[PDB]
Amino acid sequence: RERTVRLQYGSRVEAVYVLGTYLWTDVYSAAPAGAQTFSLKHSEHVWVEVVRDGEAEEVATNGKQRWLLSPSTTLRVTMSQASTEASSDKVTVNYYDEEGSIPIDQAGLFLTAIEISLDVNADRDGVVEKNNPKKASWTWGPEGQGAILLVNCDVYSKEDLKDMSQMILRTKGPDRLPAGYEIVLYISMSDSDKVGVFYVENPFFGQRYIHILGRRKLYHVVKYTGGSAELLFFVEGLCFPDEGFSGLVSIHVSLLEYMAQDIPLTPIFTDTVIFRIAPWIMTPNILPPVSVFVCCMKDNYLFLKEVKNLVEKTNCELKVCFQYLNRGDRWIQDEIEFGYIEAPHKGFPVVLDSPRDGNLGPDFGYVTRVTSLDSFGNLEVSPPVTVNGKTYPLGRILIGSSFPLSGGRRMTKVVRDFLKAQQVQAPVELYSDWLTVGHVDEFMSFVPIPGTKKFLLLMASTSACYKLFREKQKDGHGEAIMFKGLGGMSSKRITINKILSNESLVQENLYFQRCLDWNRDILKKELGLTEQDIIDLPALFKMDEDHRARAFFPNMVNMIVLDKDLGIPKPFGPQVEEECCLEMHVRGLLEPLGLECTFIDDISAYHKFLGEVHCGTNVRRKPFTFKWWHMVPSRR
C-alpha cells in the first residue's frame, strides 16, 4: 500500500511509518523557487529510491548524486523494521541553484516506524496467526479463509470469556508514539448490535475485563506500549444471521493523527478483520445420540419404564422432565429444538426455545423467542444428501406448509427467515396443512440403515394400512378388535370389519394418501431419493370439519431413533393370534434391515386415544464431523 507524504517547503516533516506500507515523497514542492537540482542523504534503516518518470534507482546513505528537480521525479521511501530508541530514521534532501554546489536549502523527513496489525484466526485452526493476508475477507469452502465468531447464548472475568473468539493487536516500536498520534479500535453503528468486544483497560490494577465495543460503544482508544506488545481482545457475536443480517461483521483499528482542535483526526493507517457469526445447525436422526429427553405426566408409568428400557439398550443417558403450567403436553418435542454451533476453537449444543405461554443444564446454549405450524414438531432435517450433483453435507431442513394459493396455514415468516438465513441447511417446504395439528413429524421420519452409510425415508401410508386390513379380513380376522386394553374405547367395539365398511372414512383416507404422495414426490425431488430409499408404514386418519387429518391410531412414524434401536409408538392395532397385526407388519419391514423395534405405550395411562399424544421426546445428538465452513452454499 503506497502512502503520500510530502516534504514541506522550508521545514522538517515528522511522520509515523507503518510497516507494510511505503511512502511516495514529493521533493519538488519543498524546493525554493529557482532551485535547479537536489541531492539526498538517508539513515541506515531507511531505503530510498529516486523515481523519475517511472524509473526507480536505489540511492546510498551518503552520496553526492544530483538529480534535476522535476514534478515527475519523486522519492520512494521504505523501511523493513520498526524503530527503537536507538534509531534515528531520516531522509534529508538538499537543494541547489544553477550557480553553486553548496546547498541553498534543505528539507527533512524524520520517521518513526512501527508495526501495527489486528490479528484473528482466519485460517481456522484455533490459533491466532500473525497478519493473515486474507483476514479482511471471508470465503467459504475447504480452501476458504476468515475468522469465525460464536453467538453468546448465555466487569467480567478471564475464565468467563473462554467461549469467545480471540483478536490480538500486535505492535512493535519505540517507547512512545510521536506527539499527536493515537491508536483507536472501532466498529460501525450497524454492527454495534451484532458484536461485543472485551479487554483489560488497566492491567496494572488487575485482570478485570471490560466491555469496550458494542451497544452504545463504537470506538475505544487503546494505550500504546513500546517494544513488542500484544493486546488481547475477546469477541462475541450477539445474534444469529437473519433476514437483514448476513452474519458478517467487521472490526477496525486505525492510527489517527491529531490535526488541531475542532478538526477531525486523520486516519493515517487502518487495518481490518472480518468475522462470520457461526450459523445454528440442526441434527438429523442418523447422527449418534447422546441424551434422550422425555416429558410426560408423572403417572404415565408404562411410558417411562419402556423408554428407560429402550435407552438402556444403548449408551445414551435418559433425562426425564415432567409437565409445566406454561407448556404443552409435548413441549420437549414441540417447544424445544436441539441444534449446535461450532467455531474452530469451540462448539456447543444450542437449544431453540419457544414456550407456549412464554418463560436443560449448563452445557447448552439457549436461544429463546402463531398457529400449530410454528411448533418444532413441524421442523425436521434430512441426512446429508446429493441432489443433481449438488451436495448438502449437513442435510436440508424440512418445514411443513400449505399450497401457495390455498390461503392455509404457514410457519411464521420470522422463523422461516431465520432458518433460511443460516444458509447451510438450505430449507425445503413440504405440505403439512392437511393435518389438523399440521406437523411434518406426524407423517415422516428418517432412519439410518445399520452397518452402512445409508438411510431410509419412512412415510406414513393409509394405502398400506387398508391393504393389510383387507388381507386380514380375507383371512377371516374381520372381527379382530382394535384398542384392546383401552377401557374408554371399548364401547366403540372397533374391528377390522367396522373400519373397512365405513365408506366416508375410506374416501377420507384415499384423499390423505394423495396428500402423503404429494410430499413423497417433493421429498424425492429435493432430497434426491428413489423408491428404494423409502419404506411405507401403515397409518390411518379421521377427518375433522376443516377437512384435516388426525391419527385414528398412534402415528408410528414419529419414533425415537437411536442408531439401530427404534422406539415406535404402540399402535394398538387389531389382534391376530394374540399379536398386534400392525406391530408384526412393521417388524417385517424394518427388522430384515437390522433395525430393532421396541413399541412404546404412551396412551394406556389415558384409557383411550382421540388422536392426541400426551408425551414427547427429543434426542440430543453429536454434531456432524463435516465442518460447516467447508460447505459452499449457493449465492443468495
List residues with catalytic annotation. Answer: 615
Between residue 435 and residue 494, which ones bind a copy of itself under the rule CB under 8 A? 463-464, 466-467, 470-471, 473-474
Which of 127, 155, 210, 259 is close enough to bind a copy of itself by CB under 8 A? Answer: 259
- Residue 209 DSSP label: B
CB 447 within 8 Å of CB 458? yes
CB 400 within 8 Å of CB 409? no
Binding flag, residue 521, a copy of itself (CB under 8 A): yes
> Residue 627, SS3?
coil
| Matching residue, cell 430449507 | 427
Nearest to a copy of itself of 188, 315 (CB atom):
188
Tell me the closest approach of the beta carbon of residue 152 to a copy of itself, in angstroms: 26
Between CA 256 and CA 268 the distance in angstroms is 6
CB 169 within 8 Å of CB 231? yes
Cα distances (angstroms) measured from residue 39 to each of 42, 305, 416, 448: 11, 95, 70, 80
Between residue 342 and residue 361, which ones bind a copy of itself under the rule CB under 8 A? none
Tell me the closest approach of the beta carbon of residue 84 to a copy of itself, in angstroms: 27
Binding flag, residue 123, Ca ion (CB under 5 A): yes
Between residue 46 and residue 85, which ones bind a copy of itself under the rule CB under 8 A? 51, 53-54, 71, 74
Between CA 399 and CA 569 the distance in angstroms is 23
Partner that binds at residue 8, options Ca ion, a copy of itself, none, CB closer than 5 to 8 Å by kind? a copy of itself
CB 281 within 8 Å of CB 348? no
Tell me the closest approach of the beta carbon of residue 607 to a copy of itself, in angstroms: 33
Between CA 127 and CA 159 the distance in angstroms is 18
Binding flag, residue 518, a copy of itself (CB under 8 A): yes
Q: What is the DSSP string of 208-263?
A: -BEEEEBTTB-EEEEPP-SSSEEEEEEEEE-S--BTTB-SEEEEEEEEEE---TTS
By C-alpha distance, which of 279, 163, 284, 382 is closest to 629? 279
Locate 368 and state its grid cell.
429463546
Locate 338 and state its grid cell.
436441539
Tell me the closest approach of the beta carbon of residue 447 to Ca ion, in angstroms: 15
Number of H helices, E strands in the chain: 7, 41
CB 84 within 8 Å of CB 37? no
Tell me the closest approach of the beta carbon of residue 119 to a copy of itself, in angstroms: 21
Partner that binds at residue 376, options Ca ion, a copy of itself, none, CB closer than 5 to 8 Å by kind? Ca ion
Tell me the closest approach of the beta carbon of residue 325 to a copy of itself, in angstroms: 37
Q: Which residues pair with 234 in a beta bridge?
A: 166, 198
Which of 61, 207, 266, 309 is close enough to bind a copy of itself by CB under 8 A? Answer: 266
State the binding string over 352-391 for Ca ion (x if CB under 5 A, else -): ------------------------x--x------------
Amino acid at 88: S
Sites of contact with Ca ion (CB under 5 A): 121, 123, 125, 127, 129, 376, 379
Provide the binding-site residues for a copy of itself, judged by CB under 8 A. 1-4, 6, 8-9, 24, 26, 28-29, 31, 33-34, 51, 53-54, 71, 74, 184, 186, 188, 218-219, 244, 246, 252, 254, 256, 259, 262-267, 402-408, 463-464, 466-467, 470-471, 473-474, 510-511, 513-514, 517-518, 520-521, 524-525, 530-532, 536, 547, 635-636
